[PDB]
Amino acid sequence: GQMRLPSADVYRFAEPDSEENIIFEEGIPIIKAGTVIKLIERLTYHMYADPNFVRTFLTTYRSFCKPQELLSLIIERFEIPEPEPTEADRIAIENGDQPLSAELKRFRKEYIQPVQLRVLNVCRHWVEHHFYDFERDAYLLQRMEEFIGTVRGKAMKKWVESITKIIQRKKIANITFQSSPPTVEWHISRPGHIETFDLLTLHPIEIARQLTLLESDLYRAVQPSELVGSVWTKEDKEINSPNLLKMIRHTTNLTLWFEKCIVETENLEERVAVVSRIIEILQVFQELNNFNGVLEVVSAMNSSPVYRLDHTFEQIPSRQKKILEEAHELSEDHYKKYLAKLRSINPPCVPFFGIYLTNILKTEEGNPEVLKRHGKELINFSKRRKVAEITGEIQQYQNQPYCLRVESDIKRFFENLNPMGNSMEKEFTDYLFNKSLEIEPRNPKPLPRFPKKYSYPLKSPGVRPSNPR
Amino acid sequence: GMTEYKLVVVGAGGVGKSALTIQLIQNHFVDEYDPTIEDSYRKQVVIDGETCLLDILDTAGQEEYSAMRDQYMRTGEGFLCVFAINNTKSFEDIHQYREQIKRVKDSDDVPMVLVGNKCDLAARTVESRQAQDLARSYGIPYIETSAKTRQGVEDAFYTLVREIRQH
Amino acid sequence: MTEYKLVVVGAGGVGKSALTIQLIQNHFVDEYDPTIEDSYRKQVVIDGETCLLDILDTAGQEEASAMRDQYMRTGEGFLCVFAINNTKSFEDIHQYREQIKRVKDSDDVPMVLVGNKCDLAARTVESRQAQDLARSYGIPYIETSAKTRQGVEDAFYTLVREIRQH
Ligand SMILES: Nc1nc2c(ncn2[C@@H]2O[C@H](COP(=O)(O)OP(=O)(O)NP(=O)(O)O)[C@@H](O)[C@H]2O)c(=O)[nH]1
Ligand SMILES: Nc1nc2ccccc2n1Cc1ccc(Cl)cc1
Numbered sequence A: 001g002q003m004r005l006p007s008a009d010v011y012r013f014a015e016p017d018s019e020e021n022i023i024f025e026e027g028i029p030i031i032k033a034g035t036v037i038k039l040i041e042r043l044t045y046h047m048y049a050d051p052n053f054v055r056t057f058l059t060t061y062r063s064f065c066k067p068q069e070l071l072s073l074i075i076e077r078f079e080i081p082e083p084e085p086t087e088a089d090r091i092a093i094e095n096g097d098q099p100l101s102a103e104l105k106r107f108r109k110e111y112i113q114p115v116q117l118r119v120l121n122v123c124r125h126w127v128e129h130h131f132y133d134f135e136r137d138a139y140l141l142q143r144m145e146e147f148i149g150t151v152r153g154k155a156m157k158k159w160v161e162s163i164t165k166i167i168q169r170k171k172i173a174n175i176t177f178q179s180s181p182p183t184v185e186w187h188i189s190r191p192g193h194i195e196t197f198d199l200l201t202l203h204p205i206e207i208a209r210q211l212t213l214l215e216s217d218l219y220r221a222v223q224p225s226e227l228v229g230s231v232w233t234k235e236d237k238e239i240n241s242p243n244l245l246k247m248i249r250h251t252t253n254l255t256l257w258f259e260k261c262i263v264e265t266e267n268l269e270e271r272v273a274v275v276s277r278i279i280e281i282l283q284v285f286q287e288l289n290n291f292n293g294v295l296e297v298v299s300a301m302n303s304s305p306v307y308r309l310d311h312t313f314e315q316i317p318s319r320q321k322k323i324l325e326e327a328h329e330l331s332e333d334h335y336k337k338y339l340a341k342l343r344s345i346n347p348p349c350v351p352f353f354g355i356y357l358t359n360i361l362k363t364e365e366g367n368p369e370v371l372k373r374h375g376k377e378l379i380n381f382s383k384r385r386k387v388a389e390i391t392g393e394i395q396q397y398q399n400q401p402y403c404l405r406v407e408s409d410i411k412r413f414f415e416n417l418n419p420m421g422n423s424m425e426k427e428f429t430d431y432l433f434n435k436s437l438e439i440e441p442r443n444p445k446p447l448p449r450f451p452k453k454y455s456y457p458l459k460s461p462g463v464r465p466s467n468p469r
Numbered sequence B: 001g002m003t004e005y006k007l008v009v010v011g012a013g014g015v016g017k018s019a020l021t022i023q024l025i026q027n028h029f030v031d032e033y034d035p036t037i038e039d040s041y042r043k044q045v046v047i048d049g050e051t052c053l054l055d056i057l058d059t060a061g062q063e064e065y066s067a068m069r070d071q072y073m074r075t076g077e078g079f080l081c082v083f084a085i086n087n088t089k090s091f092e093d094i095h096q097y098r099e100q101i102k103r104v105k106d107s108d109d110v111p112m113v114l115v116g117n118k119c120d121l122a123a124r125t126v127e128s129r130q131a132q133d134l135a136r137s138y139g140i141p142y143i144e145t146s147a148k149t150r151q152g153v154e155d156a157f158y159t160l161v162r163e164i165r166q167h
Numbered sequence C: 001m002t003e004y005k006l007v008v009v010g011a012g013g014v015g016k017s018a019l020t021i022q023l024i025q026n027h028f029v030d031e032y033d034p035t036i037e038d039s040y041r042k043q044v045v046i047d048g049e050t051c052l053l054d055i056l057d058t059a060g061q062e063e064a065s066a067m068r069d070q071y072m073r074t075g076e077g078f079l080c081v082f083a084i085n086n087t088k089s090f091e092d093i094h095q096y097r098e099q100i101k102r103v104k105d106s107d108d109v110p111m112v113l114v115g116n117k118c119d120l121a122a123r124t125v126e127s128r129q130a131q132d133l134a135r136s137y138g139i140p141y142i143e144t145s146a147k148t149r150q151g152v153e154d155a156f157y158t159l160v161r162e163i164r165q166h
C-alpha cells in the first residue's frame, strides 16, 4: 500500500488533496489552481520531478508569494519528521535484536530523500536562474546561505556543498563553433576610417551583420524579471526593465535613422539608391533570421514620411519591390506569417519582441489572480503557466549565438547612432514629414529637382558574400 | 459575405487600455483569456440588425516601439483613442494620437471615438465635461467604459462601427 | 513542428550536463556541479524538418538512483553516456539500459551509446569494446567531446532520427 505520511498537524504538506486546496486541469497532472502550500508540495513532489513546473513557479511566484515567505515555506517543506518504530520493530527491540525498520527505511528512500532533493533543486534553480531576488535582498541571501550551509547528513552532502559553491560564485559574478565566421566585408569606407562610415559607404552585408550581432546581444540580455508583472509598462519601468527598454530604443532609433537617410536625400536618383540599399540590408537580415531587423526596415518603409514617396517607389527595381512586399506580408493578419516563419527557421535568430510583450500583458490583464471555490481563494496557477510559456519561448531563442565576427568600429558607429539629436520626438518626426513634403510635394504641386549630395559612387556592391583565400 | 471592420485601439500604456478589447472579445461571462489563440481579436456581432465581423488590433504593451505606430495605424478603418480617467497625461496625449491618425490615413475625417477608461478605483482626474468638450471640438463621440464591469465596452465599439458606416 | 523528448543518462561526472549545455549554448562548462534534474528546449532543423527538442538532463550521483522511473516513463529516447577515461562509468551503462527497458516495458527503445571526453588522450575504454556493446543493443555508438564539440550534434541528432523512425 501507499506510504503513511506525517500527521498534517505537525507537517502541513501532508494534508489530503481536495477541491478546497487544489484543482487540476482535465502523464503527470497539470495544476489549474491551488493554495500556496499545495503548489509548493507539488513543486517538490515525492512521486515525480517537474522541471518545467520549477521554472514556471520560480519565474512567476512573486505575484502570489513574497521571496522571504517562499524560502520559509520550502525550509518547512524540507524538515520532514521520521515515523516512529512499528509494532514489529518494537518487538525486536524488546528482545534485544536490531529492528528491520522496513517502513522507516522505505519512507526515507521514497518520501524524505526525493522531497528533500527536490527542495534543493528549487534552491539550485532559484540561485542559478533567478538570482535577482538575492541581489535585491541581502538578508534573503544570508538566509539561503545559512539554510544550505546547515543541511546535515550524507545523502544530500554532494548537492549542499555544490550549491554553497554556486552561491559564492554567483555573488562575485565563452563560445565555441567548429566553423569559422565569414570574413568581414568592406566597401567605400576602409578599416579604421570611422569618420567616413555611413549607410552607403559601409558594405551592406556588413551593416546587416553588425546590426544583427548588436540586436542579438540586446535580445539575449532581457531577463524574465523585466517582463513578469507587466513591469515594463509601469511607472518604474526604467528601474525594472532596463535591458528591454534599451533593446526597443535601439530598434526605434534604427527605424528613424532609415527614415532620415531617405528623406534627407533630396535628389530623386540618389534617394532611390538609398532605398535600394536599405532593401538590400533587409535581404541580409532575412538571410540571418534577424526578424527584429526585418521589421525595423519595414516599419521605416511604412512610416508616414516614406510611405507617400510614390516617385521613389516607382523606380525601385521589381525584384526589390518583391523583397519588401514579402517582408511586409510577415506582419499582416496579426503577424500570421511571421509567427509561422519564426517556428520553422533554424536558429540563431533575433525575434521581434513586441508580440511577446502584448501577449504577456494581455495574459496578465485578462485572467484573475485567484479562483474562488468552496469559500476558498485559490491561486490561479494556469495564468502563471501561460505567462511562463511565453518567457520560456523567449529564453529558447536566447541560447544560440551567431557565428559572425564583431567589427568594433562598425559596432560603435551603430551603438552611437542618434538620428534625433537633441530634438524631442514630435519635433523630429514633424521635421521628417516636412522633408517628405519638400522632396515630393502633394499633387498637384509639381515635382522639383534637387542637387546631388553624395560625391562617391552610388552603385551597390551587392549582398552576395565574397571569399578570397 | 458579411462586412469586416478593421478597428485599431490607440492610447497611452500602463493604464489599463487592454481591458477594453479583452472585455469585448472575452467570453463575456467567464473572466479568462488566451491572447495567443488565433482569432482572439475577431468577433462576429450584430449592430443595428446588420451582422458584421470586427477585427481589432490592440498592440497594448508595445508603446515604446514608437516608430511602428504609423505602420500599425495604417491597417485601420476606425480608431478608438483611449485615455484613463485617472491619468491626465494620457488624456493630454489624445491630441497627438488624433493628429498622427489623420496624417497616416491622409484624411481630416477619419472614423474615431474618444474613450475614457476607468481602470481602477484611484481618484478620477479627468472630468467627463472636459472629455466631452474635447470630443465635441473634434466632432467625434465620447464613451466612458469600466475596465472591470464591462460597462460602456459594447457602446464604444458599436459607436465606432456606426461612425464607419455613416462616413 | 514535432516535439521530441530526449533524456541524457549515465554515471556521475561523465559529462551529461556539459554535453547538453554545449548543444544548447555552444559553451563548455568547466565546473562539476552535480545535477538533480534540469530541462532544456531547442528548436532545430534536422534533415530539413523543424523540431523542438525537450532535453532532460538527469542525476548521475548514486544518491539519486531511486528517482529514475519517473523520467524514464516520459522520455522518448535516451543518450546513454559514459566517459572513455572511466571504466566504471562504462560498466554502469548496462544498468541504465536494463532499467529503461524495464520501465518502458520494451526491447525497442530509441537509444544512442555515447563515449564522452574523447579530447582526452588517456583513454581506458577502447572504442571496440564500446562498439561491441552498442551492436549487442542494436544502437549506434558516437564518441563526443563537450569541450571541443566533436560528435555532439551527431549524438543528439542521431537520437532524434531514431525517435522519428520508431
Ligand atoms: N575534458 C573534458 N572534460 C569534460 C567533458 N565533459 C565534461 N567534462 C568535465 O567533467 C566534469 C563533469 O561534467 P558534468 O557535465 O558536470 O558531468 P555530469 O555527468 O553532468 N555529472 P552529474 O551526473 O553529477 O550531473 C566537469 O569538470 C566538466 O568540465 C569533455 O568532453 N571533455
Ligand atoms: N508601395 C509600397 N509597398 C510597400 C510594401 C511594404 C512597405 C511599404 C510599401 N510601400 C510604400 C513605399 C515604400 C518605399 C518607398 Cl521609397 C515609398 C513608398
Ligand SMILES: [Mg+2]
Pocket: C016, C017, C018, C033, C034, C035, C057, C058, C059, C060
Ligand atoms: Mg550533470
Ligand code: NA
Pocket: B086, B087, B088, B089, B125
Ligand atoms: Na493624473
